[PDB]
Amino acid sequence: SHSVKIYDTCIGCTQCVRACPTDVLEMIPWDGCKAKQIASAPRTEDCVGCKRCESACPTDFLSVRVYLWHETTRSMGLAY
Amino acid sequence: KPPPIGPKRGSKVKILRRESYWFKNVGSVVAVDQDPKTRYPVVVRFAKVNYANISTNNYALDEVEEVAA
Amino acid sequence: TFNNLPSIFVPLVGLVFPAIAMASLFLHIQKNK
Amino acid sequence: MRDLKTYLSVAPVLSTLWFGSLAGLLIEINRLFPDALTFPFFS
Amino acid sequence: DISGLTPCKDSKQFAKREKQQIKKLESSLKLYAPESAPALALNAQIEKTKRRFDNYGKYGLLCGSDGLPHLIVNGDQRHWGEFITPGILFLYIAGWIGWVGRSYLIAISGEKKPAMKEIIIDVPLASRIIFRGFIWPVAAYREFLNGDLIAKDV
Amino acid sequence: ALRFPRFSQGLAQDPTTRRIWFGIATAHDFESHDDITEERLYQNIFASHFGQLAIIFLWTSGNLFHVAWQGNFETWVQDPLHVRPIAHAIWDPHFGQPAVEAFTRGGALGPVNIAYSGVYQWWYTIGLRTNEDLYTGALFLLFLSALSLIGGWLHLQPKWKPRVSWFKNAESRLNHHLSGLFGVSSLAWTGHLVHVAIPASRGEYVRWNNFLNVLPHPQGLGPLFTGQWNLYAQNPDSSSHLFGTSQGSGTAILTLLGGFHPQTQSLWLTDMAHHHLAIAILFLIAGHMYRTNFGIGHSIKDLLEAHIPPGGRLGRGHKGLYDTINNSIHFQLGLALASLGVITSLVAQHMYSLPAYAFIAQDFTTQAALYTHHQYIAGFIMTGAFAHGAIFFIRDYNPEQNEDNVLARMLDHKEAIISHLSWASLFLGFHTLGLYVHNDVMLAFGTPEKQILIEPIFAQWIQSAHGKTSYGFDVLLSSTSGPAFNAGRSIWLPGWLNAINENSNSLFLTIGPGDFLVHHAIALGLHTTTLILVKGALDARGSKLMPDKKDFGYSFPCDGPGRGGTCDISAWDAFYLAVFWMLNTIGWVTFYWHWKHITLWQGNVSQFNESSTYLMGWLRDYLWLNSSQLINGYNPFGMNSLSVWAWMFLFGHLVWATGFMFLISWRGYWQELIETLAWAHERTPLANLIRWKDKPVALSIVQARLVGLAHFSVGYIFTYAAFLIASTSGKFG
Amino acid sequence: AHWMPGEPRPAYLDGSAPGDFGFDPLGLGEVPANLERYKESELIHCRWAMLAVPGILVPEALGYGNWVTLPTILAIEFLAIAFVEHQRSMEKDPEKKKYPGGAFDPLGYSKDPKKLEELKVKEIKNGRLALLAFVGFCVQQSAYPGTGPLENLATHLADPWHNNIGDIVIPF
Amino acid sequence: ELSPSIVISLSTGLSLFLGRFVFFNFQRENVAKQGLPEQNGKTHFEAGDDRAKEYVSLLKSNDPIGFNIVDVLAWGSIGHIVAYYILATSSNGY
């Protein structure tokens, strides 16, 4: 559904995923920062698009980035 | 090199990154990650916050340029 | 008959052409291949 | 008091002081010099 | 006599506006005694109206067919009291406001937390600057020549 | 793509009901459709243009057919000033007998609708003096619609399928369109006016059976080939001409006597003939400009790469601009809608003043309906021009291929442009609202002599620069000694002067301080709509709040509550709020127009010149007063012909208020409400048997925005149409 | 060697060119190509004005014509002059576009380069003076409609402290 | 009367003389400098448009300068134009 992307400006503060209410994100090891971790987005099918991840990305503009795309029943957040 | 690679701690620096809030604005380098594998070591501290109420951001060495002052 | 043609065409158009159109378009919406 | 003057210098208190003084100025001008459409001095 | 407008000192409908407003204020004047506060205030407003109309007559205002003063902005020397002299009077004050504000923001710019000086207005600083905008048309001109008016990008 | 949207498998893979709306709304966004190319894009556009032409010819054929079948045109030709036009008859079975009795106008045996479109006047001015003429025209336009349809069908087939290298042929296309489509087209229109319309005005009917025999001029083509063109301007209908009969007629076909016909208060048909002829010469000459298969002509690419100013002010100039326009269909569309909106407003501004149709100046509802129509159309077309420029800056703008050029140097100082347009709008709104409010107060204090009344000296100077002696400037045409007056002293200026000085017609109206103030309101509206649109277009690629806006596209709801909040950040939302400000601006324009004109027609120009300088005059003397005969279209005791306009008035009020629902209320309250509704439907017995196929959802934010604007604009338009038509028809002055 | 001694001379004109006094306050001749085109056009304007001014005052001193049909004289003019002007346009050497020489330089004035430079200075000075004189003719005919230039010089020499430009430049 | 057959032939021969002799080198220079109407860096015919194909057959003139039929149409269109301009502006006494 939605296309979440994490760019290489991430500092690995784990706010993107601790804010994400649908388990879309997960921190993985990395070698590009002092924290040695970066966020990944495997479960984009569970992405609703609420952008709580990028409302918590403390960078110049953003490192995590949500692109609104094909909306399915779970990205639209329907219990019916 | 083990000696510093980037600007000095306190060197007021300009941002050449086009997507940042402080583009073509000066800053104040508070730290430079001397690890020669990180992509954006230059920790800058600006005076005025961005839209997310943040005054600091990591920048690269090529995305930064020190002023003549 | 020319005075009677609106009486044939207006009930034809404004009621049947919605029937035909909205029905066929609802079927085109609710379709699967 | 230093803090009372710090509060009197705050933006709304100083704004209402400034605009009360200004409004009294323009009011007394439009009472002493009412109904003014043209500047007749060196006209 | 320009733009097809007769002056108000020799207009008929302007005097008619005068007479009509005076009769309107006199109709509201035959309901009180001529020595009480309402009648005195009405007579004061009446004299105010009459002097108003006579002042608009004597300044050379141009009253159209509707009988109201039509201001001329084109730049006619007779009608610089309409726009150009009060326009300069405006721009002098407006640039005063802007210049004292700009010199204030530049004054607090070298502060540790400048924003608190925009909330808590440093009245001594501004008051020392509040008269510095009296000379704005020359100080701003020099800041433009010296390069201090407009900032540089870096 | 499996479900109804065959052109987007992202909406077909949407179990909700958003797919229906987005398959309607993106149906015509071909460059966003899935799995397509540039060939298919241009070819679908070409077939779509064929369909549009088919619809246009069909709609004109419907107009002609209904005016011929259900109209009174043969009666309108005889006594046009005192016989009412008829658009089409009405068969509404909900009608009551009072409404059947009230809507029977124009000498009809049944209910009818009065043609406030002026098609009667324009058909009568170009010949067409019988119902059979209109029937032949309608049948021929039906043939033309079928022709466009088969053309667009076959040009989609693989055998006749033009390649993108053919659509991009921006020089052959320009030469052909200029020369033929404008020059030859206006030349053929002259060949109608000279052979048909003028003879139909001069008397005799020249039709297909006898148009080869009838000489349009008693000396046929000798004067043209021998250069003695002045023999076509000998007897120019010397001021006693009755339109439609030989009394006081002449023999000329091409004149420059200027001014108006005295009977019709319209332009001379000979002037229109000579006009279309002259501009035909100009367009046929200009269409031989651009380089084609014959070795001569210009390459627009090198015309643009040559117009780079030395000095670097513009920088790289227009370099790389041919490639960024010809490849970009949105740039072509934006420039096209720019020009089209400007000339549409020109059509309005010149049809109200210089009416080119017989007996359209003296009828007063068509002259207002057309102006209002074309100006709202121009405002929409202009908003669309800018919106498509924004869509270009996102989709089709390649910053590397046009680096440092006029377009790139443009996007650099977008902040300067936006700030100075903001200044202009802020200045205008502040000052002019302040003046209107000062005058509102000065009237509210009984002191109208204290009002800020600025005489528009500059527009009055231009008026006196054209022959209006109502101000006494005596400059360049009101001064007899001016060389400009001496040059055209013997060509057009007698007619033009007895037209512009005649205070009954509507060209170069006597303007006053209210005209100044409402012109500045108009400037506020234009500068502000421009601000909104330009700012959206230049921040379409990005800004500081959302620099990667090009990646989200032109139309997207927001970017979330982060970074303070990003509601209505897309360039689509700039277009949105600009449509609001556009409707406001055109409302000011048309309110000004309708009040000035209804006061002129009624006779009391003093009403506007005294009451237009303070807003309570517009609220009282224009809206409250002219809405007297409208809202009484159906009282508790009876109705009249203006019942439909009152019902439409209230209908437009209703949708204009319903738009506030989709605008004020946003998505989340409605999603939760629909969740409750879905619970109730799935747990309500005898309706559990019925289950939806598309999962119901509240409307998307961008969608509901669009829907609110649709209701808002429909209500704006229908309300003002009702009010304008009913006020100018309740009295006709 | 300076139009206003004290002003900094720009970098692109410094005295080397024939007629260089550093008068480019608007910065028109910044780029070199426009500068070259400008000095070409300057020499041509100069030569036309210097052809014009003796064709004004000499008719006025004797003929008194005041320097004031179409479809034949216009055609012969265009035919005679467009040929020469395009043939001038067909040269590409710039110093030969300004100063062709050859079939245009008889009498051997261009035989010595130092006197050639001095005579180029003379041409450009007299030509700027003549351009000013023609603009004076035009504006003196605009202000005074029906008077001649030498007539205006007589008007000045009659009472110069009462008949001068001032009467038109200020309203009073 | 300006002899409408003499002024028109005169102006046409004049335009043709001004074309071939006076400035054809300038016109052909500008043609070769502006070049073909390229799209995306290539000619239309080189981009797939079979219908452009600049007609070398119509341009293959053996006039020693190369005055093709299209330049004859060009200088002669301008000629008849200036001719009828003179004739019309001379017809009326204005």
Ligand code: CLA
């Ligand atoms: C209950 C209210 C009501 C209703 C239902 C109608 C119904 C009608 N009136 Mg109206 N009328 C009413 C009240 C009403 N009237 C009142 C109170 C007055 C004032 C007294 C009038 C005054 C009036 C006049 C003056 C005229 C009518 C006419 C008509 C007829 C139009 C013909 C038609 O089929 O339109 C078809 C529908 C449209 C053209 C609407 C187009 C817009 C739609 C919504 C968009 C379509 C979407 C899409 C493109 C197509 C997809 C298919 C679609 C079916 C879903 C129709 C029978 C006309 C008539 O008799 O001519 C035949 C006419 O001239 N009426």
Ligand code: CLA
């Ligand atoms: C922006 C639009 C606008 C404009 C242009 C005006 C303009 C005016 N209004 Mg209107 N008005 C407006 C909006 C506007 N108003 C609105 C929105 C309202 C509703 C709030 C009103 C309500 C209103 C009322 C009710 C009245 C007016 C009046 C006036 C007049 C005021 C004259 C006056 O007393 O000034 C005189 C000058 C001053 C008060 C300023 C003095 C400045 C000080 C002294 C500093 C300058 C000296 C300084 C030291 C420099 C000197 C030079 C040297 C030292 C360097 C003037 C024509 C009055 C009038 O007479 O109407 C004709 C009046 O009765 N207005």
Ligand code: CLA
């Ligand atoms: C001379 C040859 C010629 C002619 C006549 C046309 C004609 C046309 N082409 Mg073009 N075309 C040509 C050659 C030609 N083409 C060539 C060689 C190419 C090669 C690439 C193309 C490529 C091309 C494309 C790619 C497209 C067209 C399109 C069109 C149509 C434009 C839409 C329309 O009707 O508005 C015509 C508008 C006007 C005539 C006038 C508009 C503006 C005037 C100035 C306004 C003021 C006057 C106003 C009309 C008065 C009204 C008063 C009253 C009567 C109402 C039109 C039929 C489009 C189309 O519809 O596809 C079929 C399209 O998409 N053409």
Ligand code: CLA
């Ligand atoms: C009556 C309604 C109204 C008004 C007044 C405005 C006013 C404005 N709009 Mg528009 N707007 C409106 C409706 C309105 N809008 C609607 C319905 C929409 C659709 C969403 C938009 C969409 C819109 C956009 C998208 C844009 C604007 C812009 C602007 C500004 C234009 C600059 C200008 O003229 O300002 C001059 C100032 C005014 C008109 C304000 C009038 C109030 C007076 C002057 C204040 C002083 C009174 C008093 C002393 C204050 C104290 C009050 C109280 C606390 C005691 C201005 C603030 C543009 C902008 O910001 O450009 C700068 C812009 O980009 N507006």
Ligand SMILES: CC1=C(/C=C/C(C)=C/C=C/C(C)=C/C=C/C=C(C)/C=C/C=C(C)/C=C/C2=C(C)CCCC2(C)C)C(C)(C)CCC1
């Ligand atoms: C966004 C964008 C876009 C769009 C835009 C637009 C839409 C614009 C518009 C614009 C417009 C809409 C404009 C207009 C203009 C106008 C003008 C510029 C005018 C001018 C005028 C003149 C010059 C005049 C003259 C004259 C007169 C005065 C009268 C008489 C005659 C004469 C001629 C003399 C595009 C796509 C492009 C691109 C991208 C970006």
Ligand SMILES: CC1=C(/C=C/C(C)=C/C=C/C(C)=C\C=C\C=C(C)\C=C\C=C(C)\C=C\C2=C(C)CCCC2(C)C)C(C)(C)CCC1
């Ligand atoms: C005479 C007149 C007129 C007209 C006028 C005009 C037309 C003008 C223009 C003008 C212009 C065209 C201008 C421009 C400008 C620009 C710029 C660019 C500027 C800038 C400035 C600045 C920057 C400043 C600043 C400041 C100051 C000084 C003040 C305060 C502070 C500040 C800092 C803000 C009329 C007739 C109507 C009326 C009467 C009067």
Ligand code: SF4
């Ligand atoms: S919030 Fe942004 S910076 Fe923090 S861990 Fe997530 S992606 Fe990295």
Ligand code: SF4
């Ligand atoms: S948009 Fe919401 S669901 Fe998607 S990744 Fe961000 S926080 Fe998680």
